[PDB]
Design an enzyme around this catalytic site. Sequence first.
Site, PDB file in Angstrom:
ATOM      1  N   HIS A  21      15.080  -1.343   4.533  1.00 20.31           N
ATOM      2  CA  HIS A  21      16.284  -0.536   4.428  1.00 20.31           C
ATOM      3  C   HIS A  21      17.325  -0.768   5.519  1.00 20.31           C
ATOM      4  CE1 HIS A  21      13.657   1.639   1.441  1.00 20.31           C
ATOM      5  NE2 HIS A  21      14.761   1.407   0.746  1.00 20.31           N
ATOM      6  N   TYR A  49      10.610 -19.222  11.198  1.00 18.63           N
ATOM      7  CA  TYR A  49       9.569 -19.919  10.398  1.00 18.63           C
ATOM      8  C   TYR A  49       9.072 -21.201  11.079  1.00 18.63           C
ATOM      9  CZ  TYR A  49       9.393 -17.083   6.273  1.00 18.63           C
ATOM     10  OH  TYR A  49       9.188 -16.013   5.433  1.00 18.63           O
ATOM     11  N   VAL A 127       2.967 -10.742   6.694  1.00 17.92           N
ATOM     12  CA  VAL A 127       4.284 -10.064   6.633  1.00 17.92           C
ATOM     13  C   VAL A 127       5.386 -10.960   6.127  1.00 17.92           C
ATOM     14  CG1 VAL A 127       6.132  -8.920   8.014  1.00 17.92           C
ATOM     15  CG2 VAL A 127       3.718  -8.249   8.303  1.00 17.92           C
ATOM     16  N   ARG A 128       5.385 -12.215   6.524  1.00 16.35           N
ATOM     17  CA  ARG A 128       6.425 -13.137   6.006  1.00 16.35           C
ATOM     18  C   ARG A 128       6.050 -13.669   4.622  1.00 16.35           C
ATOM     19  NH1 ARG A 128      11.423 -12.250   6.984  1.00 16.35           N
ATOM     20  NH2 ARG A 128      11.300 -13.733   5.150  1.00 16.35           N
ATOM     21  N   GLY A 131       5.466 -11.239   1.626  1.00 18.88           N
ATOM     22  CA  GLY A 131       6.822 -10.811   1.346  1.00 18.88           C
ATOM     23  C   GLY A 131       7.608 -11.781   0.525  1.00 18.88           C
ATOM     24  N   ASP A 132       7.513 -13.042   0.917  1.00 23.62           N
ATOM     25  CA  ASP A 132       8.338 -14.089   0.300  1.00 23.62           C
ATOM     26  C   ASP A 132       7.882 -14.300  -1.143  1.00 23.62           C
ATOM     27  OD1 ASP A 132       8.291 -16.270   3.198  1.00 23.62           O
ATOM     28  OD2 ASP A 132       9.697 -14.517   2.738  1.00 23.62           O
ATOM     29  N   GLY A 136      10.632 -12.208  -3.164  1.00 24.33           N
ATOM     30  CA  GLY A 136      11.504 -13.360  -2.898  1.00 24.33           C
ATOM     31  C   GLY A 136      12.312 -13.746  -4.075  1.00 24.33           C
TER      32      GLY A 136
HETATM   33  C1  BLA Z   1      11.853  -7.398   6.699  1.00 25.45           C
HETATM   34  C2  BLA Z   1      11.941  -6.878   5.242  1.00 25.45           C
HETATM   35  C3  BLA Z   1      10.684  -6.983   4.424  1.00 25.45           C
HETATM   36  C4  BLA Z   1       9.577  -7.793   4.576  1.00 25.45           C
HETATM   37  C5  BLA Z   1       9.184  -8.750   5.682  1.00 25.45           C
HETATM   38  C6  BLA Z   1       8.691  -7.440   3.473  1.00 25.45           C
HETATM   39  C7  BLA Z   1       7.423  -8.004   3.267  1.00 25.45           C
HETATM   40  C8  BLA Z   1       6.734  -7.612   2.100  1.00 25.45           C
HETATM   41  N1  BLA Z   1       7.326  -7.260   0.889  1.00 25.45           N
HETATM   42  C9  BLA Z   1       6.283  -6.925   0.045  1.00 25.45           C
HETATM   43  C10 BLA Z   1       6.507  -6.487  -1.285  1.00 25.45           C
HETATM   44  C11 BLA Z   1       7.621  -6.260  -2.111  1.00 25.45           C
HETATM   45  N2  BLA Z   1       8.848  -6.492  -1.596  1.00 25.45           N
HETATM   46  C12 BLA Z   1       9.735  -6.198  -2.635  1.00 25.45           C
HETATM   47  C13 BLA Z   1      11.090  -6.364  -2.355  1.00 25.45           C
HETATM   48  C14 BLA Z   1      11.998  -6.757  -1.383  1.00 25.45           C
HETATM   49  N3  BLA Z   1      11.466  -7.189  -0.193  1.00 25.45           N
HETATM   50  C15 BLA Z   1      12.587  -7.525   0.584  1.00 25.45           C
HETATM   51  O1  BLA Z   1      12.647  -7.969   1.739  1.00 25.45           O
HETATM   52  C16 BLA Z   1      13.805  -7.275  -0.145  1.00 25.45           C
HETATM   53  C17 BLA Z   1      15.113  -7.556   0.555  1.00 25.45           C
HETATM   54  C18 BLA Z   1      13.433  -6.825  -1.372  1.00 25.45           C
HETATM   55  C19 BLA Z   1      14.307  -6.433  -2.586  1.00 25.45           C
HETATM   56  C20 BLA Z   1      14.146  -4.958  -3.076  1.00 25.45           C
HETATM   57  C21 BLA Z   1       9.060  -5.725  -3.836  1.00 25.45           C
HETATM   58  C22 BLA Z   1       9.730  -5.335  -5.133  1.00 25.45           C
HETATM   59  C23 BLA Z   1       7.740  -5.755  -3.502  1.00 25.45           C
HETATM   60  C24 BLA Z   1       6.635  -5.355  -4.452  1.00 25.45           C
HETATM   61  C25 BLA Z   1       5.510  -4.511  -3.688  1.00 25.45           C
HETATM   62  C26 BLA Z   1       4.156  -5.075  -3.789  1.00 25.45           C
HETATM   63  O2  BLA Z   1       3.845  -6.041  -4.555  1.00 25.45           O
HETATM   64  O3  BLA Z   1       3.206  -4.529  -3.117  1.00 25.45           O
HETATM   65  C27 BLA Z   1       5.011  -7.074   0.725  1.00 25.45           C
HETATM   66  C28 BLA Z   1       3.759  -6.724  -0.066  1.00 25.45           C
HETATM   67  C29 BLA Z   1       2.732  -5.801   0.615  1.00 25.45           C
HETATM   68  C30 BLA Z   1       1.512  -5.642  -0.069  1.00 25.45           C
HETATM   69  O4  BLA Z   1       1.362  -6.065  -1.294  1.00 25.45           O
HETATM   70  O5  BLA Z   1       0.563  -5.025   0.467  1.00 25.45           O
HETATM   71  C31 BLA Z   1       5.276  -7.508   2.001  1.00 25.45           C
HETATM   72  C32 BLA Z   1       4.385  -7.959   3.131  1.00 25.45           C
HETATM   73  N4  BLA Z   1       9.290  -6.536   2.599  1.00 25.45           N
HETATM   74  C33 BLA Z   1      10.477  -6.192   3.196  1.00 25.45           C
HETATM   75  O6  BLA Z   1      11.256  -5.433   2.657  1.00 25.45           O
END
Ligand code: BLA
Length: 209
Positions: A21, A49, A127-128, A131-132, A136
């Site tokens: 956020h 990276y 975390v990276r 997330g990606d 992503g």
């Molecule tokens: C520094 C910011 C940032 C990072 C490093 C990040 C990492 C991150 N994003 C995740 C999921 C996710 N992240 C997103 C989305 C986004 N993620 C984004 O960075 C953006 C900009 C969007 C757009 C809304 C969604 C939709 C999920 C699905 C949750 C899940 O599968 O658990 C997860 C999954 C966790 C898990 O499954 O236990 C991680 C580690 N998310 C963050 O927001």
Amino acid sequence: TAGLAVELKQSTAQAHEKAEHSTFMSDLLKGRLGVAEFTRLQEQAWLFYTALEQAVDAVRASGFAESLLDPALNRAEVLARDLDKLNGSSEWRSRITASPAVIDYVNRLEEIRDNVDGPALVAHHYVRYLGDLSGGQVIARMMQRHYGVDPEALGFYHFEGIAKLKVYKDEYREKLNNLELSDEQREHLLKEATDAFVFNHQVFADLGK
Ligand SMILES: C=CC1=C(C)/C(=C/c2[nH]c(/C=C3N=C(/C=C4\NC(=O)C(C)=C4C=C)C(C)=C\3CCC(=O)O)c(CCC(=O)O)c2C)NC1=O
């Protein structure tokens, strides 16, 4: 009680929410910014990276978490190609500098690399890269939709070499669950994961500034 993947998700919830956020990422994803700001993001990402991948290489070489630390996840070379497209030349390499937030983040990754600290590295990897792999496509889609960014300059988000992506994420979480960790190593890992989100939030804060 439900395995490391669940505990990581729950332990990092507050820091993850704070990072997701940020004003910079929020404006970027809503179409308020431009290809320029996306390019600045990707330049700072190339710096951290590059450092993260040195630390993953050192950890993989030590024999810790090898099957998790899949080299197909490496982003640094793909990111440079993306930045070659976004900036129109290789000019950026000698121009960019780490923001203060990126200095701290890179410093921590370099400490992890030279300590060969497996559990800390796994935290930063989760975390990276998870997330990606997870959000992503949403970032790549908004960059194409709002800004007209060419998908050949979004290679960082494509993960060339992975076909079935939901399967890959599922197996990544099972590989986390299967890691052999002492209570101390597991605590260290959880704390580092929160610090990883904190670094990332501060990277977006410095971008916003
Ligand atoms: C520094 C910011 C940032 C990072 C490093 C990040 C990492 C991150 N994003 C995740 C999921 C996710 N992240 C997103 C989305 C986004 N993620 C984004 O960075 C953006 C900009 C969007 C757009 C809304 C969604 C939709 C999920 C699905 C949750 C899940 O599968 O658990 C997860 C999954 C966790 C898990 O499954 O236990 C991680 C580690 N998310 C963050 O927001």
